Design a protein around this ligand. Structure first.
Ligand SMILES: [Cl-]
Ligand SMILES: [Cl-]
Ligand SMILES: [Cl-]
Ligand SMILES: [Cl-]
Ligand code: NA
Length: 129
């Protein structure tokens, strides 16, 4: 599923991401825009052979099992394919674990490079929440 901006904002708000670990909703919407273009089915393969999955591009090196990343962890205890669902629950629950691990949203390269320090509230402007 390819979300609209406000549709995804409302879904993330319902799932508890607004102000989660101090990150306002616009941060999460901005990160999803640049990680996946709001597409739950996005995948991208990394140089180490791991793969990033879903709307928040969660990496199989640490967070999910895809059966082809040897020696990797599965810290969210989920198959990576569950992160490609039109229902964002699994992605959101795993992202809460990631953002809590000490590094905040810096775990998302696109957030660090394209959202951090910008007016992220612009990403939820106009939306009915
Ligand atoms: Cl915001
Ligand atoms: Cl694996
Ligand atoms: Cl959803
Ligand atoms: Cl933080
Ligand atoms: Na893994």
């Amino acid at each position: 599923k390819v979300f609209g901006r406000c549709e995804l904002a409302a879904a993330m708000k319902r799932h508890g991401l607004d102000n989660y670990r101090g990150y306002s909703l616009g941060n999460w919407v901005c990160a999803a825009k640049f990680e996946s273009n709001f597409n739950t089915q996005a995948t991208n393969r990394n140089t180490d052979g791991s793969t990033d999955y879903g709307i928040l591009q969660i990496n199989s090196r640490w967070w999910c099992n895809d059966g082809r990343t040897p020696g990797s962890r599965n810290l969210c205890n989920i198959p990576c394919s569950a992160l490609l669902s039109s229902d964002i629950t699994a992605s959101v629950n795993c992202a809460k674990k990631i953002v809590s691990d000490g590094n905040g949203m810096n775990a998302w390269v696109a957030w660090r490079n394209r959202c951090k320090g910008t007016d992220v509230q612009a990403w939820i402007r106009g939306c009915r929440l």
